[PDB]
Amino acid sequence: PVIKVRENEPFDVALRRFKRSCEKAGVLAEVRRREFYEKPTTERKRAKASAVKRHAKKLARENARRTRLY
Amino acid sequence: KFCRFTAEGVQEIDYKDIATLKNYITESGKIVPSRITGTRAKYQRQLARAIKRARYLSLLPYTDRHQ
Amino acid sequence: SMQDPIADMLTRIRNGQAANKAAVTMPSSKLKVAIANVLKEEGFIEDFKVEGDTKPELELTLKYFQGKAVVESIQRVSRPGLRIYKRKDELPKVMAGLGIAVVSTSKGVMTDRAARQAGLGGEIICYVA
Amino acid sequence: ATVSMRDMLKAGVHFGHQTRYWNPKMKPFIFGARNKVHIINLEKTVPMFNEALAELNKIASRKGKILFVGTKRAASEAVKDAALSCDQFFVNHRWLGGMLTNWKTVRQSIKRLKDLETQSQDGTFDKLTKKEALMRTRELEKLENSLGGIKDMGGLPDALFVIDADHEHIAIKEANNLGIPVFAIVDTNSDPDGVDFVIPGNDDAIRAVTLYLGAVAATVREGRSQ
Amino acid sequence: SLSTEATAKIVSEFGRDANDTGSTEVQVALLTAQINHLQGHFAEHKKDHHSRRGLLRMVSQRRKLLDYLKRKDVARYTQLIERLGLRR
Amino acid sequence: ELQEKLIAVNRVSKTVKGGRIFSFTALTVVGDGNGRVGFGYGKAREVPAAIQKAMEKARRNMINVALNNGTLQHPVKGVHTGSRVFMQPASEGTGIIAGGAMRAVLEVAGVHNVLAKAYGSTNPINVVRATIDGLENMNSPEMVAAKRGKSVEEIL
Amino acid sequence: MTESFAQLFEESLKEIETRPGSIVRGVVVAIDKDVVLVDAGLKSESAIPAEQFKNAQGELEIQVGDEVDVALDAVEDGFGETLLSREKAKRHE
RNA sequence: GCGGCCCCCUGGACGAAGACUGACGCUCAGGUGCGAAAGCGUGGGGAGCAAACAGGAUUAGAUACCCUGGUAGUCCACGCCGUAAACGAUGUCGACUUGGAGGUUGUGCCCUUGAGGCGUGGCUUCCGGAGCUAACGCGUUAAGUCGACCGCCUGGGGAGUAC
RNA sequence: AAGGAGGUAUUCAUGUU
Numbered sequence A: 001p002v003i004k005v006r007e008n009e010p011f012d013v014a015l016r017r018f019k020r021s022c023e024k025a026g027v028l029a030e031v032r033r034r035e036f037y038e039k040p041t042t043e044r045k046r047a048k049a050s051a052v053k054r055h056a057k058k059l060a061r062e063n064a065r066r067t068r069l070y
Numbered sequence B: 001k002f003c004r005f006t007a008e009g010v011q012e013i014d015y016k017d018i019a020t021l022k023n024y025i026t027e028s029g030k031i032v033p034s035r036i037t038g039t040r041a042k043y044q045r046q047l048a049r050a051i052k053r054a055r056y057l058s059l060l061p062y063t064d065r066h067q
Numbered sequence C: 001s002m003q004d005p006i007a008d009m010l011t012r013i014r015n016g017q018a019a020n021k022a023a024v025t026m027p028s029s030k031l032k033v034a035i036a037n038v039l040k041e042e043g044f045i046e047d048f049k050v051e052g053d054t055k056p057e058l059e060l061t062l063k064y065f066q067g068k069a070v071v072e073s074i075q076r077v078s079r080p081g082l083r084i085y086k087r088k089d090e091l092p093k094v095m096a097g098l099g100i101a102v103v104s105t106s107k108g109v110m111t112d113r114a115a116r117q118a119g120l121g122g123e124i125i126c127y128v129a
Numbered sequence D: 001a002t003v004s005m006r007d008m009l010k011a012g013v014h015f016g017h018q019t020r021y022w023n024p025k026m027k028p029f030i031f032g033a034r035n036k037v038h039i040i041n042l043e044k045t046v047p048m049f050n051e052a053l054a055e056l057n058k059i060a061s062r063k064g065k066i067l068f069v070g071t072k073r074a075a076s077e078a079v080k081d082a083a084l085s086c087d088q089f090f091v092n093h094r095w096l097g098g099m100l101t102n103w104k105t106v107r108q109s110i111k112r113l114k115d116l117e118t119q120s121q122d123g124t125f126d127k128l129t130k131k132e133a134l135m136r137t138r139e140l141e142k143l144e145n146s147l148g149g150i151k152d153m154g155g156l157p158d159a160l161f162v163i164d165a166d167h168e169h170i171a172i173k174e175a176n177n178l179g180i181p182v183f184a185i186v187d188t189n190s191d192p193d194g195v196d197f198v199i200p201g202n203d204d205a206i207r208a209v210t211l212y213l214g215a216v217a218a219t220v221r222e223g224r225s226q
Numbered sequence E: 001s002l003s004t005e006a007t008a009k010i011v012s013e014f015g016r017d018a019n020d021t022g023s024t025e026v027q028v029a030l031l032t033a034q035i036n037h038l039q040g041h042f043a044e045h046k047k048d049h050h051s052r053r054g055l056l057r058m059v060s061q062r063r064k065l066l067d068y069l070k071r072k073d074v075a076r077y078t079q080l081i082e083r084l085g086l087r088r
Numbered sequence F: 001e002l003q004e005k006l007i008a009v010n011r012v013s014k015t016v017k018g019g020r021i022f023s024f025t026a027l028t029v030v031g032d033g034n035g036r037v038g039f040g041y042g043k044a045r046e047v048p049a050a051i052q053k054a055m056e057k058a059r060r061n062m063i064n065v066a067l068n069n070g071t072l073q074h075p076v077k078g079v080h081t082g083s084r085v086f087m088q089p090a091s092e093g094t095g096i097i098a099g100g101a102m103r104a105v106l107e108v109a110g111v112h113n114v115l116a117k118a119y120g121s122t123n124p125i126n127v128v129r130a131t132i133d134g135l136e137n138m139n140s141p142e143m144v145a146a147k148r149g150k151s152v153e154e155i156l
Numbered sequence G: 001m002t003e004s005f006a007q008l009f010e011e012s013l014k015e016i017e018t019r020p021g022s023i024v025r026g027v028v029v030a031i032d033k034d035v036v037l038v039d040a041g042l043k044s045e046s047a048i049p050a051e052q053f054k055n056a057q058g059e060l061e062i063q064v065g066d067e068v069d070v071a072l073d074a075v076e077d078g079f080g081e082t083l084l085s086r087e088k089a090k091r092h093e
Numbered sequence H: 001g002c003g004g005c006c007c008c009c010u011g012g013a014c015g016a017a018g019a020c021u022g023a024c025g026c027u028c029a030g031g032u033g034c035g036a037a038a039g040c041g042u043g044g045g046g047a048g049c050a051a052a053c054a055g056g057a058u059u060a061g062a063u064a065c066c067c068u069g070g071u072a073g074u075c076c077a078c079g080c081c082g083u084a085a086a087c088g089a090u091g092u093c094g095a096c097u098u099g100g101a102g103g104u105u106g107u108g109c110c111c112u113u114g115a116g117g118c119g120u121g122g123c124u125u126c127c128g129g130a131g132c133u134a135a136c137g138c139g140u141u142a143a144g145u146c147g148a149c150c151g152c153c154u155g156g157g158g159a160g161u162a163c
Numbered sequence I: 001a002a003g004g005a006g007g008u009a010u011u012c013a014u015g016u017u
């Protein structure tokens, strides 16, 4: 994320652009993931668990529109 | 999202076309997910291969910072 | 691999009756047609026919009386892994006589009652109730 | 009295739900699919409807009580008018679980409603405080919405005419438990197993429910004329 | 695997027309050519266990075909295992 | 005219916050000694209330059995959960040679001669369900002939 | 003699067009405060919000029997209710 | 078990239409082979990581968790080893039995009107019906219904131990 | 870090930027 300062752009405005650019490239998430080694089994387990719960919540939501709560 | 390779009949993506490939890399230089671009999985694999071949021949940069 | 076409035909009848199908179809053979005739004459199936010249297909139209299927149970008795033969005195009585035991005697395939009257033993293909 | 394919087709009886919601048990009555929507085979509807009408007529002639059950927003007022105009009983609000199988407890509530209603006519809700005249009034309103169509039934009915077999599964199951035949308008997404006189056809259009109810009300009216 | 031209030559030699590809003789001949070819590969690639599993399937299939042929017509079998230079 | 029989009474517990709440369950069977038999399972805090609830529940939900002169039509098999139950028609005079729960249900349904044997879990609740299911899945020559489109003499 | 449902439906189908995106005549069957019940000859009578008819002048410019026109969304939508819309038909023409 | 890109050698799977062989099949004790990681032998190589170990803290104690280092090992070549929660805790082969939403890879047709519509194959994820399941569940990829053949089980501990 | 909104999420000309 290489942000060049634009003309007339105040520092706060440029800084917001730079922070969002980094958050878009996902630098901090990448660094946190590479702090410590995790076994391939741990990685696969975590990936599979997120998929299962994400799918379950989507299905739960898509059935919550069916019924009325009051 | 609509795939721009299925609608054009493209068989092979080609690594020598540095206009289409520039649309499919980000500013940092990484390949954009197919979930974002709406490309199909078959063309995604071809596209990733083409981008990697272009990087070797220095038609595309590996990252935004080595230059 | 298919190694008991008779059991396959019994299985198709059982599954078709359980799934309330009008008719079932299977590849044909003369032994299958013989068993089908015994069933039809005992009133367990409504009709049967064979269609096809080089690869005949045997079609059986199944019977339901009060919504329920007529064949309550049908089980292969002699099987390739264990053949069963019985002398004339030792013929079985399926459901105290209320069922039929398809017995392949030397004079053809018939019911247990017919073979017992004809004084024959033979192989026991199936029990039908 | 008598309906025909043109009348059913004008009211929209052939339309069903969309294909991905159907019941495989409902396949026989399905004509085809058009634009991802099932189409109901009116050649099955007409003889089934006429046969259900004949059985309903016979019950009405033998002085059987008919309970018109329909509670969807598309058939509440329709079922109320048909049962009033055919001299029979109805339920058009949320069916109380146990109306039939728990008739003893439901009957005590019926008695409470009658006493409350007579008290209102007499003027009893004047001696008590204003709050006790709104609480009891509110109690009467609730009891009317729930059991206002069967307050005079006095017993288990002899037939149910349920508009939506899908929505009113509880009522159909209680009927099957007790022994009461069910005449049900059944859509493509519904289960016809607990129904004794199935009538395939759209059950969500006001036009269609009015069609079924007018025919059924006329048959019961004529059978009681006898 | 075996090239298009190589298969065509073998089919002509062992089949009684250009369209006879299913004959036991032709099948054994095709299997034998491919088996003989792969020997050089597995001489250089002793650690290619995955490809070697494919090769063992071929060897196994040739034995089954030869057993059938020997039981079905012994004279064709002797002629074939002599032309193809195969023991037993 | 309905003979009734209580087969088993059993004390259960619920273990509420304050301690154990003991209640009673009663298994009963009623029958007219001529082919109709039903079972009822009632729970309560006292034994009389439990048996009363069970008897009432059993008088309802009765079914009809096709009995042959105080005996079965043919050998039957009944299975419910982990209970298998074999029953066989016997000759007049043998008596009812059956197990523990099977004895009560057969006596009240009017079977005077039977050879019965339970294979598997002999839990009275499941045994009663299995024997009643077997008695219900038993057909007579009349209905078998009607089903097959024959006469009874044709079926013999 | 009877025009079997096959031929009868074969006529009906070209008489009322069911395309997800085609405007069709719709007769208002009932006016309500915030909803309007229209019928286009489909699986159900759609409940359109009334503000497409109480116009920018705040006037419910229509009433019962008005052959309005509305956009077809689906002959059945999840809960057996045809989905229609008036401002869609508005915006198209 | 396999993850940059390129080349060379090589195995299997699937689809379309057609031709050919003519039961040549399925299963398989014994046997043979493959088989994570750790480990072993011989020689390499060694950036990072890291048993053992050394030190610093924590603690009533701390032969641990935490910190700073750090050797074998992890990498290569050639041999051993033969084992894992080697798991879908579900042997292989075949047939039959209501449905729905998807993924992935072929193919046919229709107006491709513009990513459309309509079919038909392979593999695969999730719901689910009847039926099966002590129950959980399972469900056309069964744990329904059947057939062929092989492997195993017979209370818990002693013990997967002794000989 | 905290809250709000939209979705299971984008088509949303390119250009400009």
Ligand SMILES: [Mg+2]
Pocket (backbone or CB within 6 Å): F120, F121
């Ligand atoms: Mg036991």
Ligand SMILES: [Mg+2]
Pocket (backbone or CB within 6 Å): none
């Ligand atoms: Mg072995």
Ligand SMILES: [Mg+2]
Pocket (backbone or CB within 6 Å): none
């Ligand atoms: Mg190792």
Ligand SMILES: [Mg+2]
Pocket (backbone or CB within 6 Å): none
């Ligand atoms: Mg070493």
Ligand SMILES: [Mg+2]
Pocket (backbone or CB within 6 Å): none
């Ligand atoms: Mg070394």
Ligand SMILES: [Mg+2]
Pocket (backbone or CB within 6 Å): none
């Ligand atoms: Mg350390």
Ligand SMILES: [Mg+2]
Pocket (backbone or CB within 6 Å): none
């Ligand atoms: Mg082991």
Ligand SMILES: [Mg+2]
Pocket (backbone or CB within 6 Å): none
């Ligand atoms: Mg593993």
Ligand SMILES: [Mg+2]
Pocket (backbone or CB within 6 Å): H087
């Ligand atoms: Mg696993």
Ligand SMILES: [Mg+2]
Pocket (backbone or CB within 6 Å): none
């Ligand atoms: Mg194991």
Ligand SMILES: [Mg+2]
Pocket (backbone or CB within 6 Å): H128
């Ligand atoms: Mg499931």
Ligand SMILES: [Mg+2]
Pocket (backbone or CB within 6 Å): none
């Ligand atoms: Mg040992």
